[PDB]
Amino acid sequence: RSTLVHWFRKGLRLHDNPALSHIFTAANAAPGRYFVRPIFILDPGILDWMQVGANRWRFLQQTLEDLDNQLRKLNSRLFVVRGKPAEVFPRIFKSWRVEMLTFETDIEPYSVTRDAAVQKLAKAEGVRVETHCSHTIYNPELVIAKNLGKAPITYQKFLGIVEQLKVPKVLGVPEKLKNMPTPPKDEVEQKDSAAYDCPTMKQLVKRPEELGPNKFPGGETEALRRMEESLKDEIWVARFEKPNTAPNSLEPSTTVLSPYLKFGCLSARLFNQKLKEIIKRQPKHSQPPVSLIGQLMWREFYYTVAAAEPNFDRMLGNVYCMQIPWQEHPDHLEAWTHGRTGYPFIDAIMRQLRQEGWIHHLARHAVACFLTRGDLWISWEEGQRVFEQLLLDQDWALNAGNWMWLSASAFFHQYFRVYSPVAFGKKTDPQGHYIRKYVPELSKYPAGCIYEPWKASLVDQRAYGCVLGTDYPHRIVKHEVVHKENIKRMGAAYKVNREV
Numbered sequence: 071r072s073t074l075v076h077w078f079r080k081g082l083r084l085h086d087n088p089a090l091s092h093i094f095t096a097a098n099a100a101p102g103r104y105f106v107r108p109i110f111i112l113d114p115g116i117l118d119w120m121q122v123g124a125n126r127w128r129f130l131q132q133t134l135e136d137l138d139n140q141l142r143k144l145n146s147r148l149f150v151v152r153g154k155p156a157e158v159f160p161r162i163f164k165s166w167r168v169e170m171l172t173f174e175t176d177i178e179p180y181s182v183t184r185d186a187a188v189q190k191l192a193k194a195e196g197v198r199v200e201t202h203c204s205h206t207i208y209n210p211e212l213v214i215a216k217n218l219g220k221a222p223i224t225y226q227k228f229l230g231i232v233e234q235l236k237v238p239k240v241l242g243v244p245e246k247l248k249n250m251p252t253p254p255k256d257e258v259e260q261k262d263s264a265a266y267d268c269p270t271m272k273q274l275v276k277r278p279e280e281l282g283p284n285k286f287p288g289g290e291t292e293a294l295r296r297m298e299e300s301l302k303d304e305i306w307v308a309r310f311e312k313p314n315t316a317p318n319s320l321e322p323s324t325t326v327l328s329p330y331l332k333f334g335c336l337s338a339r340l341f342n343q344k345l346k347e348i349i350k351r352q353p354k355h356s357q358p359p360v361s362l363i364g365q366l367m368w369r370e371f372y373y374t375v376a377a378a379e380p381n382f383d384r385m386l387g388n389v390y391c392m393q394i395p396w397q398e399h400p401d402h403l404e405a406w407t408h409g410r411t412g413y414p415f416i417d418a419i420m421r422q423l424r425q426e427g428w429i430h431h432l433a434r435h436a437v438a439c440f441l442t443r444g445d446l447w448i449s450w451e452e453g454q455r456v457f458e459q460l461l462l463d464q465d466w467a468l469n470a471g472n473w474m475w476l477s478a479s480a481f482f483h484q485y486f487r488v489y490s491p492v493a494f495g496k497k498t499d500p501q502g503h504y505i506r507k508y509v510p511e512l513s514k515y516p517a518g519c520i521y522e523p524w525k526a527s528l529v530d531q532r533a534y535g536c537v538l539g540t541d542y543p544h545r546i547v548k549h550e551v552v553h554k555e556n557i558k559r560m561g562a563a564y565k566v567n568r569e570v
């Protein structure tokens with residue numbers, strides 16, 4: 071008796087999972103011949119390549135637990151194997167007598183490298199590998215091919231290409247396993263009945279004092295519930311315009327499906343279908359790029375450019391990226407990182423990020439503009455790294471793609487348009503309710519100066535119980551001065567990149 075193995079990495083769902091469904095149908099179409107091991111490998115190597123904050127660890131813990139629970143309802147279970155794939159797979163290929171290995175493809179460089187080696191090993195041991203592109207709606211390889219070898223670098227061109235592509239068929243959940251016994255304990259399982267159990271919170275989250283509120287629980291089950299909840303107002307869905315949603319509403323102004331789509335607890339292809347059904351029902355609706363389908367296409371767009379550039383997350387050796395002289399300033403980077411810049415709007419956002427792990431799209435605009443071309447002149451690679459740690463929806467391609475945009479390094483080139491850290495939030499939150507929440511030490515400043523507390527006289531600062539320089543920092547820079555200087559810096563950079 072040989073085993074069929076589905077390998078989870080992303081695609082942490084049961085629904086719309088061709089690679090997992092295939093394993094399950096195979097076992098039921100040939101009962102008595104196959105054991106079924108759906109695994110997730112706790113890979114220590116990813117930590118040398120990416121940073122993970124406490125809140126995102128918790129999300130994953132919650133995801134794996136839900137995935138295990140959902141697998142049990144199909145007479146299976148999640149096997150969480152600790153260890154490196156390069157050492158894990160030779161062992162289990164033998165100990166398990168693995169006939170077939172399936173998994174969802176991924177375009178990230180670490181994934182590509184790791185997957186190539188696993189496929190070299192699988193080819194040696196005579197293991198059949200079947201891969202599926204289901205993490206995105208479109209296959210970046212096919213998009214690039216259709217565009218004659220190059221990723222479209224504008225959204226409109228990208229849209230014109232995928233319009234001509236076949237939308238894939240969205241699968242349901244696999245059928246339950248018919249008459250399958252529990253796989254026999256292997257070398258590891260016999261010395262430890264729990265060697266493959268889902269990790270506890272204690273095991274994954276080493277810094278639990280950094281956990282913020284539990285608002286967006288992980289797992290395919292919460293993902294589908296949140297999707298259904300977001301689709302209940304079909305008018306809000308059909309008339310969604312992303313630029314008109316607020317960054318600083320106390321309640322999220324968008325769906326906050328990003329963490330779910332990032333881990334694949336929600337199939338983007340299912341989400342897209344559910345959106346097409348509402349658009350069809352609602353004749354007055356928005357169109358890309360501002361619509362919600364448009365939002366999913368921004369995801370697809372950035373996955374496609376990133377599939378073409380292994381260096382997508384850095385400035386050097388990145389085909390798309392303007393080379394800019396970003397300066398090193400540790401102290402300003404620390405202040406930004408910890409929301410101690412002295413600009414209440416920026417600080418409020420960066421504290422919401424660190425506490426909760428999600429901030430609105432245009433709040434990320436604000437704080438990223440400030441770090442890079444706006445104000446501090448600090449490389450976008452540094453904002454990407456802080457974002458990588460803190461974001462529940464951390465996504466190699468989406469994080470890099472949007473930082474290059476916000477920094478006018480690629481895709482976006484109108485660097486003369488600069489967000490004001492004082493003015494930008496006022497449009498949607500003139501009372502500063504968002505600042506009061508996330509910068510509580512300013513909670514007693516009236517609207518007139520809560521965005522600019524340095525316009526309050528010292529006497530009033532003592533009356534509101536927050537003296538700048540003691541209870542809340544002074545501005546680490548003066549926006550009105552640095553942003554003008556930075557525009558000239560950006561113009562010089564653009565000139566140099568144009569002549570090379």
Ligand SMILES: Cc1cc2nc3c(=O)[nH]c(=O)nc-3n(C[C@H](O)[C@H](O)[C@H](O)COP(=O)(O)OP(=O)(O)OC[C@H]3O[C@@H](n4cnc5c(N)ncnc54)[C@H](O)[C@@H]3O)c2cc1C
Pocket residue numbers: 312323324325326327328329331332362365366367368369370372429430431432434435438457461463464465466468469470472473476
């Ligand atoms: C500096 C910066 C960094 C970012 N880093 C990430 C990141 O690491 N991971 C991430 O998922 N998004 C990232 N984004 C894009 C965007 O901010 C988030 O996708 C969005 O805030 C998620 O909230 P939502 O799910 O309510 O979005 P909605 O507006 O509800 O959109 C639904 C989905 O569409 C996709 N989407 C929406 N906007 C974008 C966009 N601009 N680019 C790409 N896909 C988009 C996401 O999958 C999102 O879940 C970043 C943007 C900026 C400016």
